[PDB]
Amino acid sequence: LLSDQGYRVDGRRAGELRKIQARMGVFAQADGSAYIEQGNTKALAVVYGPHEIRGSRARALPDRALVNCQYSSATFSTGERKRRPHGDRKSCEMGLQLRQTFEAAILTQLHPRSQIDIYVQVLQADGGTYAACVNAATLAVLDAGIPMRDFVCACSAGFVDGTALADLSHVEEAAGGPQLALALLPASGQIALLEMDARLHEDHLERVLEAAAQAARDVHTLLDRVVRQHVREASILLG
Amino acid sequence: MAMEMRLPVARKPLSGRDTKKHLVVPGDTITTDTGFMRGHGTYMGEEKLIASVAGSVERVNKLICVKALKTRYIGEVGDIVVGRITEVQQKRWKVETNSRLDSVLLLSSMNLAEDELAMRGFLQEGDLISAEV
Amino acid sequence: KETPLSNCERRFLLRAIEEKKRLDGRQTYDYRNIRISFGTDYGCCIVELGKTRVLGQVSCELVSPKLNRATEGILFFNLELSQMAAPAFEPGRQSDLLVKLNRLMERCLRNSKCIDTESLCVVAGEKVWQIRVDLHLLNHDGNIIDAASIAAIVALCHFRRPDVSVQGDEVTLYTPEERDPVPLSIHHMPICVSFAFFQQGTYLLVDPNEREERVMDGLLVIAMNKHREICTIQSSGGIMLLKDQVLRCSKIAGVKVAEITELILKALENDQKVRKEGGKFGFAESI
Amino acid sequence: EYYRRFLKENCRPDGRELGEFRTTTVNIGSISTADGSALVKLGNTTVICGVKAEFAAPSTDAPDKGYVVPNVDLPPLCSSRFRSGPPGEEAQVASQFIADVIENSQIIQKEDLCISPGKLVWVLYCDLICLDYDGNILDACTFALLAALKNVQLPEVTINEETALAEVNLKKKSYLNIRTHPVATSFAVFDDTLLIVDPTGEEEHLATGTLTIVMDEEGKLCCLHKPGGSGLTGAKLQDCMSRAVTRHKEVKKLMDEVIKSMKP
Amino acid sequence: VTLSEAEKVYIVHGVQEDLRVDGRGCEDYRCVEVETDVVSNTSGSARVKLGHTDILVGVKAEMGTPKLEKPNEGYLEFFVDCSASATPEFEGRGGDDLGTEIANTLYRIFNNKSSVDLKTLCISPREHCWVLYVDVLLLECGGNLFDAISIAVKAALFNTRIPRVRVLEDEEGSKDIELSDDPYDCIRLSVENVPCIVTLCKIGYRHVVDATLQEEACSLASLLVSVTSKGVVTCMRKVGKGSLDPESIFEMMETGKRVGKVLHASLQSVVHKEESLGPKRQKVGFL
Amino acid sequence: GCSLRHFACEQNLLSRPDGSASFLQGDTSVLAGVYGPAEVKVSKEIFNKATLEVILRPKIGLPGVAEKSRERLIRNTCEAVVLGTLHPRTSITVVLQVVSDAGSLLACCLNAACMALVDAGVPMRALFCGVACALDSDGTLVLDPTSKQEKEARAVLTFALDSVERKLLMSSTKGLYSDTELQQCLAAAQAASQHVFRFYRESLQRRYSK
Amino acid sequence: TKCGRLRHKEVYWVDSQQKRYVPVKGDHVIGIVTAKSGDIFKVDVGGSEPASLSYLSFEGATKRNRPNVQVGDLIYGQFVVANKDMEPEMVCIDSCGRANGMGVIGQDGLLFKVTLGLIRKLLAPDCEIIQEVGKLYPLEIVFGMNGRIWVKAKTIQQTLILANILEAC
Amino acid sequence: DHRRIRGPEESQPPQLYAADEEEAPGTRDPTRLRPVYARAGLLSQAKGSAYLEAGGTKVLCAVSGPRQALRGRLLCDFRRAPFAGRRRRAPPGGCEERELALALQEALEPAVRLGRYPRAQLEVSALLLEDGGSALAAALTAAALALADAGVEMYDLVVGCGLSLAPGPAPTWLLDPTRLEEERAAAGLTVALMPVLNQVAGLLGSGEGGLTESWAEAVRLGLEGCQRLYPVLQQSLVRAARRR
Amino acid sequence: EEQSFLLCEDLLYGRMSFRGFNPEVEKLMLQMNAKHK
Amino acid sequence: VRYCIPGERLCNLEEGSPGSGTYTRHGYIFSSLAGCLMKLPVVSVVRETE
Amino acid sequence: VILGNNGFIWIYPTPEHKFIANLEPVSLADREVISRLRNCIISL
């Protein structure tokens, strides 16, 4: 049982999100640090900013910056203990898609011979891991002041019983089967990244994609408040 | 010899701001009056000035820019700077500050072949120097 | 150590894209002429997508099952880039493209529920079939995704496993001399179609080859079905695209999966009619 | 040096002439904690072979056969050409050589290793650490393998009342039986059909081709291992056989004398 | 390479006259922050915050074979992920080096058989016992790395709640296990014999408790002493490149047991203040 | 009466490599692709001779220890026959992918490697080919055994021979044979090498028709 | 040392359809600029090691006048030193000291790669395809002895048909 | 995993299935050393080598030479032989070997002066053939003698001895135990000091139970033991130098 | 003793054009032809 | 002739000067290599090969 | 004190002489004033 009489397992309808709270500037030792939580999924993101290349100096590109992303899950995430060394295949992909989304809109043009590292550590996974990681990395980058095209927000969506669902939990990704996560920058409506692993029929596709994008826009209407609230309580202390 | 532990205190908002500084986040639109030049910390999109880093805005008679709150050090002409030496290359030293690249210090600026092997002696790898830009 | 592309190569090829003309002479919506060949033994296939050869092999054993899943069989995939395929494919250097192909193939042909896992269980908790498929990239001149998906589906269709008989607790297998090996249970045939996006989504292309991948900036993969169900999609290359584009892309991908499913069925029928009358390898349609 | 620098002398620069199978010594049962141990020193090439025994489950295809696993490891303890970490190419080639020598010669019947056919069976781990690598690692490896499997003692085991029982110090140790005696001789080939016996490091390294013959008592050839080419004709192989018989006789005399010395 | 030698000689002359760079004495900790039960997917969780350095420890429960050496009671397992969150110096492979070493030390700290009562962890002997998976995930390394890990693992083992399971077994296979309801679960560990690590890093003639990054980098050698509550001293280690003269070992050993008494009593008081205060209250804050 | 089974040989299948040789021997099948003279890393810089790498991969499972020993045998046979002093500080990579395993892999592998080194254009002093004999319990030898003849027999010998004077280049062994059996298998291998070396020349004339 | 058909002229020589080019002294080779390092800049040939060029080797260049060479532009020239001992070096000037059409080719012309046997067939004085191609319509092409063909026509379709007819035999 | 010949899946040692009660070895003098047989320069292809034997404990060490402020870095690798001890370890190992390697590296750098080796490295390789007793201390002593015969500059040799505590009602420290005396043991300690400069170079010892006085007595007894043990190593290295 | 191939048999020209398509090209081709003849 | 180990002292600063392969502590010159010594003299300890 | 225009602040005791490394030990009151400035800068 997933959705009957319009109500889900968590007790929320098909359109609304989870409760997500993002905090900026955790680790003052680093450059940019963000901690976000979407329901019970905890995500932590650290970016060390545009520092020069320390070793292996042949990697540097002459025109644009280089973006390095590494995804590491905690060993105590789910019930079964999993080991991040010798379990690299799932992670290698999750890092390379982050590399794609943050070479998409980070403006590498302004930083020649520059390395930007984005490290994301997940502390407690409860479904929708990828969207939480992308949102944490976006808040972390906008801490450190790397100038980018647009605020980046990601979410997920499923399709059960003729209705689209937004922001799945672990239960709904477990039994259901249709997952579709996307990363979106809302100033131009351009979908930055798609992920979908399903048996979904073609005639429904557009519908769930709209709902997915709609959920992403709701994320953009929430985190923005946090960012503005944060930057407002910067300026009162300055001038 | 005494040690102390405490529960971690939750941060308080602590409020009167009294500030009219105009504030932008990346993605929104700067108000366009015709006769602006350009700015750093922003870009051109769809023939519209779009800010690119969260912070406040600054307006000069021709210049409109966005001032952030936490950046690394940007190269400015007349500034004095402190730096840490990292490597000893052949004609120059590599100096690390909190800039986006490690700064370079040529040997021709340092007031003291005869220079090449003796270069290592009077300026050790890992000390702290102060200089103008 | 690979040879770099000229500036004039880039300029001339983009100017060729701006008037909707490829290099070889086909249109924008044309796959290259494909060829399916089979090996001697069961489950060995060679797919030519057109100067691009992919070898496919299916092996199968009896392994004790995973503890959480006691009543179905395990699928285990390995797509390994051979050294002969490209001069820059030294072992350990190309980890990124390796993971990006491997996980896409694994997600498609596992989470699509393409071939049955529940038909494999012999004794619950003790003995279960375990299917390992291996795809080798032999020649690199185009989509490794499309040719790999074609080779994996053809190898899953052509493979036969030896019979086991269960009587009480006795599990008695037989040699391929003693019993005919039964074919494997397949629900449907999902397949991958690759789309190339050029200069921020203005120009849509199908099936880029080597130069056509070096000049492009966007790649998209759509996996579809005979019954026009979409299995998996994945974007790569760091591009930004509107949803109208993927909505028009699903239709063309449906037409293409229909045609290639026709080709695979002709391939299997022609190979079986060859092996009914003396035994050989059965070529297959190259159109 | 040079190929002419080794060829114009046309006499071994150690001082040994030709067909001088150099000085070999063994120590028997030196390492007490293992079940079987052998130390072989031949021309300052030093190889220790150790044998551990452990109970395990046999395969479904071989329900009553017994496993034997050799592993020749080459640490950087011996020479500077070997690097730390995973084993190099030379160790893998030598390990597969010891493996197919054990497989082809049948120095031990697998069937004699059974305890209960189907449930428990012996596993003999034969680990070979080279100590000082100069030349002809294959000869010292297989000869240390023979001496170590001569030192193998196993205790009596019996499964009774759903319990496997072993009585180690209860005077139930017995010698493992051997069927044959395979001995390898390896030759180094220079291009002018001057073939030499038992090369050293510079001696093998400037030489082109390498040959290896493993022989039983009766004249049975275990394996003829020759990578490297440089041309060869069968009469030269007949000469190889005729010398390897004599080296087999000599090393059997030596191993028999050392075992008769360490009889008590 | 991390700091100059003139500032080294300034730091050592500050050390010899009881005023370091922050103004602490010879034998004074800075403020230590201990937070109970952060991660809500574990059996036990702790967060520990010292200045710059941050250590979070999660403890889970699992079932498994006890062992063959010690058959009738259970054991502990440690894994330290020196993550890429702390420095870019250890990013892909350098973290598993240092993250090895810390883990090894913890085994020695728990190689007592009198450390934690392992006879509590037995379900039924030779068949099923509990395995405490303790995982240490440090967020940011800021100096004096071994103290906060020990404080964190003590707090996390205090928060550890293990569910009460009794196994019924029959003459058949019968793996049916109860997992009784009402999560009351009074299998809380007796932590009063679990030791804590104190470093005593030596800078000049005087030895200094709780060096920072500068104060470690100016120092030659260091002594690593693990002290229990009462007077019990488990393993000692010399860590460092430099040498160490013999009477300094005895002086640092006495100072270590003194600091150990102070730490242990204060930690017990603070964590009892946590559980005395509103387990439904306090609104646990990681911001 | 000793004769091989049916040979088939194809050149220039693949586009990207410098040479391509498919070799079908009975039911078994080996495809070989060879890169020509190309760039080396600095660690393998040999000023006299050319580095010659051999990679061998079977189709089931990942490659292991025995395959490493086989590819060392390939590298030593090839560097014995490849005139490698002519091209210093360059690397030649020889890649082998097992298509069909029907018995006697090393013979078909050496034949494919020889044809691939010919068609890629690397200068060599001589051709080389591989054959195999199988000694049963009685002593009747069979040239180029099948998997069932390889399984039943007590000895399997694989010989790589040379084209100038039919000398022995490489030899591998799974068996317990005697020396006179070795001599007879070597003579039968020389006759089989004569047949295969004629088959080389026929296919090399079959290419150059245009 | 190779397979081939033996031919003689009064010298004995064999030819083989092979793809990889070996560096031979004094051949006309299209190369690709890799990067520049000070006075010299390196060029990919398609051989064992990349060759070198000096900017003063082009026609009419000194320190006062840099020749316009950009990273990633094809260059037509010939090797002056090419042996087994050192890395090869090429020039873009004749022996007398002038450029006979050497230097930068330019842009807007399709480059592709063929077998050396096709070039040794087409650049005979007795040829067939080149006269028909010149008879049908206007175009201009550049051959390069490492196996490389550059083409240009007025329109793109004729350029593609030219490329297919050249490479398809 | 696939670079070595695989065999059975899971194997068990016979001693756990062995049904016998092994007696304790009894009572001895506390300062009863084992006889020491050491010789240096045994190997040929290594630059320096040493072989150390004490009762049932055997260890061998060899040093690869120097290869290409700036400071030398000796990285040391410690492998145990796979047939040393009752149970057979995996040939990579991976858990305990890196733990002993850090003890080796943190005990050898006070010995080897590294200002005389710019931009170079030293490879100290120790191999433990028979785990008869004090395993870490014999490895330290043999590595010190091998580095000394190898010809790198030092300040002093490194002499190390291990200790152990019998778990009786009166805890009495034992010096240089055998393997059975470690199997019966509760807590074991290991020290190493340079005897001329009279400074401790590294101490590593796991505990089971003790008090601060007892650890102090064990440390000073180990110092007495190493100072006592030194001259045999001296005369052995003198004879090894006289062979040169 | 020389591996050349231009001064073995016979080559053609340098930068051969066609259909007076280009310009300076025709003259260069003519010069090459003159050298050949 | 005598051979010397690194730990043992050689002489005082008044009797000699540290020249090569040794080091200097307070009031003492200690050798630093394993080999033979040679020698206001300049004393130094070397090994026979280098 | 040197207040760099980047993010560095350097604190050093004042010299009366008004380069060479004066490695003499600084007196205690001067050190405690130096360390009082540092903590205030951290707090700010």
Numbering used by the authors:
A (entry chain B): 6 to 244
B (entry chain H): 1 to 15, 19 to 115, 125 to 145
C (entry chain A): 2 to 288
D (entry chain C): 12 to 275
E (entry chain E): 4 to 290
F (entry chain D): 25 to 234
G (entry chain G): 81 to 90, 99 to 257
H (entry chain F): 4 to 71, 91 to 266
Authors' description from the paper:
The eukaryotic RNA exosome is a conserved and versatile ribonuclease complex involved in many RNA quality-control and turnover pathways in both nuclear and cytoplasmic compartments.
We engineered a catalytically inactive mutant of human hDIS3 (hDIS3cat Asp146Asn, Asp487Asn) analogous to the previously characterized yRrp44 mutant (yRrp44cat Asp171Asn, Asp551Asn [Bonneau et al., 2009]). From the larger particle population we obtained the structure of human hEXO-10cat-hMPP6 at 3.80 Å resolution and from a smaller one we obtained the structure of hEXO-14cat at 6.25 Å resolution. In the cryo-EM structure, hCSL4 is only partially ordered. Similarly to the yeast exosome structure, the corresponding CR3 motif of hDIS3 forms a long β-hairpin wedged between hRRP41-hRRP42. However, the CR3 motif of hDIS3 is twenty-residue shorter and lacks a yRrp41-interacting loop (corresponding to yRrp44 residues 60–67). In hDIS3, the CSD lobe is separated from the S1 lobe by a large funnel-like cleft, reminiscent of OB fold arrangement present in RNase II and DIS3L2. The long RNA channel path in the human exosome is thus formed by the combination of an open conformation of hDIS3 and an apical entry to the exoribonuclease active site.
